Amino acid sequence: LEQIFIESNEHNSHNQISQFRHAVVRNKCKHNPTLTNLSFDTPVYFSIDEVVTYLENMNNEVIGKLAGEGKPKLANETLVSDRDELYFDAVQSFIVASQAAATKASNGPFNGEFDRMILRLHTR
Amino acid sequence: LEQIFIESNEHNSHNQISQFRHAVVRNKCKHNPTLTNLSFDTPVYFSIDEVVTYLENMNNEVIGKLAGEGKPKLANETLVSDRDELYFDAVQSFIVASQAAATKASNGPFNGEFDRMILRLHTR
């Protein structure tokens, strides 16, 4: 599975491999918790599209730098505890980050670093 | 690359090749930062003059031994975040050593061992 989807010829993969494994391994649990101690390899139902949404939307996430706002900020100034609750479901739109204090925000850790992943994945 | 440039078989191979490869990675990283995990083999654009200059600076390079100053003994005593950013512009002339703490400076183990290679490369 890792092989077909994901190639490391560019060798920029470390973080994407990590969060990939994170997204997949997470996906399974929601479908049922009756099984326990699940892992990456264990085959139980999971979707590839729902996942690939996660890369796109998490790429360009913005988190508040405002005191007491250490959470992804939405276009309507909303904050979310876990990205998967909505990021998996659908892409989200976030305010642009700015240096000024009035608009003090930080981009997601991966903003602008793995869009290519999705481009190649879809050509696949 | 080894065949053309280095000729370790001639003499004193271990350190020559070691520091050579170290230098090549160090000079490669700077040029192209978009990718990661850039091994020695991987093909990327990289300039060789910079390599020779950086390589000469070592034998030229004089390090400050001041307490809390594990960095070069710069005549103007400037502080640089990265060793390499100072070397790429040109070859620097760090103040010569003296026993006195005010003028104190230090050599290195590699300094004075690469006498022949600078000329051999600059010629080839």
Preferred mutation among B32, B36, B39, B41 to probe A, highest tally of A CBs within 10 A:
B36
Whether residue A69 contacts residue A35, with contact meaning beta carbons closer than 8 Å, is answered with no
**Minimal C-alpha gap between B4 and chain A (Å):** 27
Element (H, E) at A93: none
CA distances from B41 to B2, B3, B38, B45 (A): 11, 14, 8, 12
Burial of residue B65 (CB within 10 Å: 0-12, 13-18, 19+) is middle
Report helix angle B115-123 to B49-60, nearest 10. 160
- For residue A8, the chain B residues in CB contact (below 8 A) are 37
Amino acid at B122: H
Pairwise CB contact (< 8 Å): A12 & B37: yes
- Name the phi and psi angles at B17, rounded to 5: -65, -40
Beta strand residue intervals within chain A, DSSP E:
62-64, 105-107
Q: Does B25 touch chain A (CB under 8 A)?
A: no
Give the rounded distance of the alpha carbon of B72 from its chain centre. Answer: 12
Nearest to A14 by CA among A124, A117, A121, A99: A117
- For residue B38, the chain A residues in CB contact (below 8 A) are 11
Task: Provide the token pair at A116.
Answer: 């290519």
Structure determined by: cryo-EM
How far is B64 from B100, CA to CA, in rounded Å?
A: 12
Pairwise CB contact (< 8 Å): B35 & A12: yes
What resolution does the deposited structure have, in angstroms?
2.8
- For residue A116, the chain B residues in CB contact (below 8 A) are none
